[PDB]
């Protein structure tokens, strides 16, 4: 770890600076260094970690989709052979994406999840584990694709079970987990009905618990509820 000589607090400070500068690769490297100090992460620190890698892998996914699209067109009936370059470069981006996912999954496995006992940390990390297996699933095509999908499903399911036992239905982590697990069902597991059912049930159970919330908590919960509705509108 090239961050091994930097103070934990300095790594966290620099992650926040990197965020302000929209330097998300740096942000992720700083937060990886912080995780590798071995201490548990606070709520703010967990979100710094997730923001950083979400931005990095999000850009990789967008690039992969562009390149995969070009590659599919190059392979349709009527196309002029352009050689191996599109496939090679898509593979290059894909391998870098898989590397980032493996890095995040490695941090969760060593040893963030095993030390996470509170629902807010444990559900957060298991959601991340589902998310990064989901991103691996998006590009998977080999002997391992079903197993990658089942790893995502298993992580999401454990997170779901904890969240339903330990968090209110408006908890934004619970809502965001359900949002993403619903997308997993629709886009990865070829289970659009499960996706729609989960989004709708999550939305309705949250709606009924909004009356308990402060104005600030209401704003946080209704924001994610609107994303659930947005997806439901996309899918029906």
């Amino acid at each position: 770890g090239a961050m091994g000589s930097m103070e934990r607090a300095s790594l966290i400070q620099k992650a926040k600076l990197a965020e302000q500068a929209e330097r998300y690769e740096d942000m992720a490297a700083f937060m990886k260094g912080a995780v590798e100090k071995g201490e548990e992460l606070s709520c703010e620190e967990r979100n710094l970690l997730s923001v950083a890698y979400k931005n990095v892998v999000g850009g990789q996914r967008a690039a992969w989709r562009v390149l995969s699209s070009i590659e599919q067109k190059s392979n349709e009936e009527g196309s002029e052979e352009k050689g191996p370059e599109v496939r090679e470069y898509r593979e290059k981006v894909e391998t870098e994406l898989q590397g980032v996912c493996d890095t995040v999954l490695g941090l969760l496995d060593s040893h963030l999840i095993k030390e996470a006992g509170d629902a807010e940390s444990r559900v957060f990390y298991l959601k991340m584990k589902g998310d990064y297996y989901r991103y691996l699933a998006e590009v998977a095509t080999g002997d391992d694709k079903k197993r990658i999908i089942d790893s995502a499903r298993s992580a999401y399911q454990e997170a779901m079970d904890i969240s339903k036992k330990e968090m209110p239905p408006t908890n934004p982590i619970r809502l965001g987990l359900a949002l993403n697990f619903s997308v997993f069902h629709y886009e990865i597991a070829n289970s659009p009905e499960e996706a729609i059912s989960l989004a709708k049930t999550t939305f309705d159970e949250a709606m009924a618990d909004l009356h308990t919330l402060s104005e600030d908590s209401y704003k946080d919960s209704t924001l994610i509820m609107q994303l659930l509705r947005d997806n439901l509108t996309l899918w029906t």
């Binding site: 998310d131 965001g176 993403n180 997308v183 629709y186 994303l227 947005d230 997806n231 996309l234």
Partner: peptide
């Protein structure tokens, strides 16, 4: 693409 957080 659908929304995720």
């Amino acid at each position: 693409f659908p929304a995720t957080v």
